Symmetry: D2
Subunit: 425 residues, 4 copies
């Protein structure tokens, strides 16, 4: 009945390993609104971490889910197939950028998708190594933790994660890492630790999520594409977070001018239901022999119809266009707040994948994690749910549903504005 | 909308890597019945691979899920908590064997569950290695494929999986591997490849699933518990398939006389919805640092209320007792069929985790995979969905819902009988 | 100038990790005789661990070393070549078993030899994995420690050695490991952990050295050759200790009835000078890209002429024949002693690679390591230098120079006799 | 004989993997001169690759070797000890930089030295990972190949070498890598791939050998020392090539104003005889349990006395001072040449570890591997033996024995002078 009472029960029944950003227990929600067990209402700007681009319980999505719930919820596709799985795969084959034929594998979590994307690139190229970028995030399975460019706290006390994962530098001028540096950092790997003939794939987020909402430029992605082409290396675009419309296009790669060989997706693809997948070159996808791709819950029937409905909703409700409008509105509002607060050293973002980075006295060398965390706390006190990110915990991101109403856009910014103001005195 | 038609589309849009045991597209289901897209009815003895111990769309479970769909489907627990996740953890801490304080983490798939249990075991012991058994199955992520005692097809063509996973022999007298050999193979690892101080844990299925439905004796499990104790090794019981009441007790470990340090669960735990978790000795669970455990969909709201309801159903409908009664009825009918078919060299199983193993001319060293495959095919033509298993593909298992009707017990056995009779012709 | 003071100095200058079997400092030696700094004389039955098959400072060898010492000692072959290196390779190409063209590489230590043989096999098959046997010993580099079937003390406290090295069972009837068991253990790796297409080679000692002087039968070696042939796996014969004529033939494989794809050699090859090498099927040896192989001291000029002279000595002095007779005289006297002491549960060996194993009350399950240690200690008190081995340290081995004098043979046996009598007294 | 005839036999008996810089077969050598089988005389400016700082067959060294050759050549220190080994360890413990107690392990090759240094660091810190630098060279065993910052052609076709080796950038202002970049690259590893608590050691060459004769500054070495101190990481200085006086001090670290925890040495330590070793902080060296450190040839008797004699010679003949004088003469000579040849973009070196780097049209971005190779070829025709190096094969190094006469210094410079003039014609 009370948040604290539940937090106490949480401390006795659940390990501390599982962090709790907001010590609040949600009871119900709708679109951009969430009510806790105490009846307090909050404006959701986190969206279950980019999972709710269509909002909490989108009515069209729920109706689809209820219909399937009347038919069946599980059989395990590998044993007995079913249409929602097949249908979504065909739709994904069409929506993911690429003029060649694609095939889609459905799993359940983003971690699984990345895991499987890599397995596939290995079977296709008959190579074992992979390259990932600094500040990257790909999941919490041993292998994805190795791909993830961040050790603490995910691996603390555990020891070293799986080898044969090499680290390249993600391009980021704001912090002195040029596109030439990033590209140079890959050749360095080829020259020092693993030749091209041993690299199955280069995994990259078109727009890093946990890494701080940093976007790759089309130019860079084009260089990366040519580099992979030259070495028979599979380009894996991890769009688990950037995908499903966040950047203004269904997939961020559509704005890069090049197509990846494989793409992983999840989170917002099903608008609040467990589903993930991999879509890529048909022949690369088919490199794995029959029986080598599976998963009990893979492509859960309910989640499949949810995803299918999410995609219809994007089309009928013009969410991509709104995503872009929202991003502009958000960026204009934040640049306005920025004028009165030098700590805001950057307002960026493609589509609605918006973020601001805080710096101690505008020094691009002094990340202000203290201010960042304070703003998140004050925002919560004012009924607004926020999340931070970045390898230094000084980036504030906005992952509010694309279905957000205009008045709620102003409300959220006004609250953010008040937080910075009150953080002065 | 015919099976053949849908299969053609399958080959065009989905990777062949995703095997298809039965070329049938299920449309709807109810308890033990499943109807395909052509309207044909089937008796389900596979159960979505031990995922439906409470049957397809159990009314109580479905009603709980429908109620929760009016509240919320996702927030990501680590950001905004919710009570169903918490409640399930409290209940699992009590239900999982072990007379000491315990804590639970919820994830989404069995693979993730095994992944996390190992991460936890590693953090608690400050060690990196792990020992798994021959014929074991633990998932399809890079690391769990290594734990999995089977390379083909699971990880074929992909190159070698993560090292620092050693292989022990699972006790199996039917095939000349005594418990002494099994215990001896663990010491062999200790002396030849990895000292006890480098082994965080020994992962074992109380009853092997894909491995052939081979059960560990209480005596053996007890020697294993003593061995882990002497060396400070965590005993991880993988109960993703043996759990959720399939053996007559909620968890097979209850029948072993000893408690593991960690236990993984999934599949039947939520009767048709994506959920999994890890329950273990509180001090071991707490070893991971704050923020080190987490996944986007982990402990999904809908899945949780579903799991809670499954637990209530087991109680209200006496499913554990029924599991045992069902198992005895099954083995007896199978033994009656064996009187007329030597090829059946063994009938076995705890509770309702039943299987029979085929041999050419009853020669216990001549796995009869051709016949096994023939029985599955014949069964399908008679409307019965079955699954085989075992390293040599000569084991037929029964994972029909525990909520099976008396008549369906007669029907499935009768069909099987006809299959052997019509094959012997 | 006393052994005691030198040992004290040793404790302050040299790491304890370097063990000292005998706390004696040798000053000079001749053939089978050794004198310590205190002028005491000993009979060497250890031969610097199978390094002095031609005895300490064989005059013909020394004369050759002296002649080369006037010319040059080092240029580094890969930079500026020299004849002794080339000539030795040519001779080894002829001497190593295998009725087909071969090429040879010279390195410096047995460890490097195994390292290179594996590198060569990997380039030749395009595979990364290897299989080695229980109780095997292949060197103390990271990789050769992974290949070695013994963790402590070789790796104690160091953590886990390089992965992708799988363990098979060495055939050993005396301890219940049948040949069928050995072969079956290889297929187990193929099924549970690494498919044949990922195994570049199987490394095996025709006769295990540190492992207990257990020899492989021709029948077994033949099955192994067949198995490797079927899968295109390189068979690597590690003859660093079994080679250089210790078994009656120059290389133990000659007595197996089949040829390995690669053979490693060191120790006795150069009668007490630092040299090692790898000899193998020409096509296989050529797989490595030009400039991929190298080592600074590799094929040291002085060690080469010593090796070339050692081979001449073997032919001119019929050491292969004397090896067999020495072996026979040793076994006879050891069997003689065995009749009075049941502890000696087995006398075995090919050529002069002779050993006896000790058990508590002839109980093949109670390895008498304590008695073994006592015998070594007692023999030392009597002026005889011996060495033990075997995973349980209950194996006494004789590695006395093949050039030993008949009276010394009797002398040696008498001492061993006296040791057993006085121990059991 | 004929060089070419010997080369033909070489191509038939030895694998192409063993490259041949100079297609010449040496017969005799002395100090700085080498005579091939055709009787042709050459001035040696490569020194067997920095193995002959005291020149070919230094008379004092040969005499000691002959004296030991009359006593014994091998017993294997672990079985029976001998004074030469002990004496060398005692002397290295005091000469190797480090104001604290040290212990020394003697092995045989530089590769083995690095292998053991890492093994020791791992046992001492109880961690498994290591960090190495770009362009580094540490040996050709699997593990040292992983430490080595160059894949082709060492690893070609073999697949990926051992994991858990992370790449840092070596400071090299000439090519755009600042010391800040170098240190930053280490923190990048701590943040992205391996936490400090998992890093047992950071391996570095005070002056990179094969990497291009690029030296670390005291300032940088001091920052590195401070970083290691802060995390309890062992700083291993691989002075196999930089050691034994090449830089003007016995070890290059002396000039860094800071001491390493472990130092590996080989090459010139024994002036042309197979010997290598590890000298480091005593408690660290002793972290390995007895029996854990070994090697058959380790600390070969003859090589030990040669090494002890080399040490006396440096003192008696003032080679350290001569190394600095020689370097100054070479650099002055080379600078004069560079006044007429723009392709020479840099003249550098500590003591007598001298090198010049070649660029096309004097552009640091355009390495001239072709000119470099031409100079080597022309130099040889003129009777001068040279070696090149660097990741882009455009670096000419000088490793002539420190015992060279002024006339020969002038002669070598003149020969090099002509090559450039004649290469531009
Ligand atoms: C969220 C995330 C994941 C991991 O997905 P899960 O559904 O939590 O297993 C993978 N990749 C990226 C880019 C992510 O943001
Ligand atoms: C089914 C299974 C798994 C993996 O579960 P998924 O939900 O398919 O990822 C793990 N271990 C065992 C024992 C299983 O049978
Ligand atoms: C002695 C031995 C080695 C290691 O040789 P070293 O010269 O000490 O490196 C390798 N293999 C076997 C079979 C050995 O007995
Ligand atoms: C030469 C070298 C080595 C390898 O030593 P070897 O005697 O060839 O095995 C190791 N480290 C460095 C710095 C070297 O240049």
């Amino acid at each position: 009945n009370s948040n604290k009472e539940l937090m106490q029960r949480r401390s006795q029944a659940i390990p501390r390993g599982v962090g709790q950003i907001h010590p609040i227990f949600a009871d119900r929600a709708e679109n951009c609104r969430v009510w806790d067990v105490e009846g307090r209402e909050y404006l959701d700007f986190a969206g279950g971490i980019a999972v709710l681009n269509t909002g909490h319980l989108h009515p069209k999505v729920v109706a689809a889910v209820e219909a399937q719930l009347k038919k069946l919820s599980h059989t395990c596709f590998q044993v007995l197939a079913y249409e929602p799985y097949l249908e979504l795969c065909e739709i994904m084959n069409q929506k993911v950028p690429g003029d060649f034929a694609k095939k889609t594998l459905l799993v359940t979590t983003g971690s699984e998708a990345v895991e499987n994307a890599v397995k596939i690139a290995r079977a296709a190229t008959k190579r074992s190594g992979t390259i990932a970028f600094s500040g990257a995030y790909h999941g919490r399975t041993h292998y994805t933790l190795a791909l993830t460019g961040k050790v603490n706290p995910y691996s603390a006390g555990m020891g070293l994660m799986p080898g044969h994962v090499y680290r390249a530098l993600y391009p980021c001028p704001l912090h002195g890492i040029s596109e030439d540096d990033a590209i140079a950092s890959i050749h360095r790997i080829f020259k020092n630790d693993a030749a091209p003939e041993d690299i199955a794939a280069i995994v990259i987020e078109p727009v890093q999520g946990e890494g701080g909402f940093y976007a790759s430029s089309p130019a860079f992605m084009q260089r990366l594409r040519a580099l992979c082409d030259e070495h028979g290396i599979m380009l894996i675009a991890d769009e688990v977070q950037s995908g499903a419309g966040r950047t203004g296009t269904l997939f961020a790669m559509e704005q890069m001018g090049v197509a990846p060989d494989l793409t992983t997706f999840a989170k917002s693809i099903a608008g609040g239901f467990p589903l993930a997948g991999v879509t890529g070159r048909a022949e690369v996808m088919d490199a794995v022999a029959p029986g080598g791709l599976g998963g009990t819950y893979a492509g859960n029937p309910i989640a499949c119809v949810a995803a299918l409905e999410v995609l219809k909703v994007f089309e009928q409700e013009n969410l991509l266009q709104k995503a872009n409008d929202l991003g502009q509105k958000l960026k204009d509002g934040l640049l306005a707040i920025a004028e009165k607060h030098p700590e805001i050293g950057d307002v960026r973002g493609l589509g609605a994948m918006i973020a601001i980075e805080l710096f101690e006295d505008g020094d691009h060398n002094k990340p202000d994690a203290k201010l960042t965390a304070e703003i998140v706390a004050r925002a919560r006190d004012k009924g607004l749910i926020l999340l931070s990110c970045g390898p230094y915990y000084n980036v504030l991101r906005i992952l509010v549903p694309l279905t957000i109403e205009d008045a709620q856009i102003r409300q959220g910014l006004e609250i953010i504005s008040q937080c910075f103001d009150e953080a002065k005195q």
